[PDB]
């Protein structure tokens, strides 16, 4: 404990402003001279422009949030190479393996990548291409 030497660049001496002119952070303390920004609490809102109309007020709102929106956990093909062929994949299996944690509103299997292995898969929705690839490897598909 009399030898502790933490990692280099993990720790760094706090700048201390306003304790001399040789610090370069002295008198004005990095604020300059005499404005709204040199004051305590000085500054303005994050989107203020001097009374010029802000960007957001010069452009229009758009849209609506749907309430019955369905967002689905996105599974690719690359993961499914982890399993020996002829077995059955399921949501419960994909959660147990930690590939998935949140079955958001369902599962969806997308054809990003490739499989090399014959598999029966079952899920809520498939993409056309992933269905094609699974079948082309001799796999099969069920819709839950």
């Amino acid at each position: 404990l009399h030898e502790l030497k933490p990692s280099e660049g993990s720790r760094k001496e706090r700048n201390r402003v306003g304790r001399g002119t040789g610090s370069g952070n002295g008198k004005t303390s990095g604020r300059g001279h005499k404005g709204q920004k040199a004051r305590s609490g000085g500054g303005v809102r994050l989107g203020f422009e001097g009374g010029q109309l802000p960007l957001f007020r010069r452009i229009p709102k758009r849209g609506f949030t749907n309430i019955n929106r369905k967002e689905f956990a996105i599974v690719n093909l690359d993961v499914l190479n982890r399993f020996e062929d002829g077995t059955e994949v399921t949501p419960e299996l994909l959660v147990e393996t930690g590939i998935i944690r949140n079955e958001k509103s369902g599962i969806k299997i997308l054809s990003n990548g490739n499989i090399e292995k014959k598999l029966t898969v079952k899920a809520n929705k498939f993409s056309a291409a992933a269905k094609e690839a699974i079948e082309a490897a001799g796999g099969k598909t069920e819709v839950i």
Binding site: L1, L4, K5, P6, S7, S10
Partner: protein, 203 residues
């Protein structure tokens, strides 16, 4: 490593896993966990009064103009003698915890550092018929410890804590409590067979 009775006689050897005791230690990780623990210990019971908490104020002591005195607004402002403090301390928790994996690594590493430095002492058992700091100290010569040390126990061990607690450089713990800080705070590590087995199955 060697294994020796509390008589100090050779009892044989232990195989200690290189999963724990055989890795290269990460001294940087160990430092960080030491500081985490030492900083979680601190109590943070500091406090000071500002111009709103100091008793009084309210009256402007003189007119803004026409006295020749400097403009003032309270008898308790910071620049004033019995006045407020400007920011100062406020009660804080300093405690932070690094990730569990980092902390496990820290313990594995500090233990293997003790191994490499040849400051483990592993013994078949450790018991006392009754609490007796005489006997405990005599054991601490029958093994040439003679420095600051941490005893680790899980067995029967009915009286060892008491027979050690008066000694200043000595500490004892029940083998779950083994901390990075409590280890590094000492020089040598006196771990019984059952305690090391328990630490193994934990780690």
């Amino acid at each position: 490593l060697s294994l020796l009775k509390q008589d100090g006689t050779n009892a044989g050897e232990i195989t200690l896993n290189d999963t724990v005791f055989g890795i290269e230690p990460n001294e940087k990780v160990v430092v960080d966990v030491i500081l985490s623990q030492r900083a979680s210990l601190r109590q943070g019971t500091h406090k000071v009064k500002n111009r709103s908490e100091v008793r009084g104020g309210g009256r402007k002591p003189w007119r803004q103009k026409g006295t020749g005195r400097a403009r003032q607004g309270s008898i308790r402002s910071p620049q004033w003698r019995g006045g407020g403090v400007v920011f100062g301390p406020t009660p804080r928790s300093y405690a932070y915890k690094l990730p569990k994996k980092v902390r496990r690594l820290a313990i594995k590493s500090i233990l293997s550092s003790k191994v490499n430095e040849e400051k483990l002492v592993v013994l078949e058992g450790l018991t006392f018929d009754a609490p007796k700091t005489k006997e405990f100290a005599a054991f601490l010569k029958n093994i040439s410890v003679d420095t600051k040390a941490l005893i680790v126990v899980a067995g029967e061990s009915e009286n060892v804590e008491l027979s050690a607690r008066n000694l200043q450089g000595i500490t004892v713990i029940p083998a779950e409590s083994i901390s990075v800080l409590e280890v590094a705070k000492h020089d040598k590590l006196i771990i019984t067979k059952a305690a090391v087995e328990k630490v193994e199955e934990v780690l």
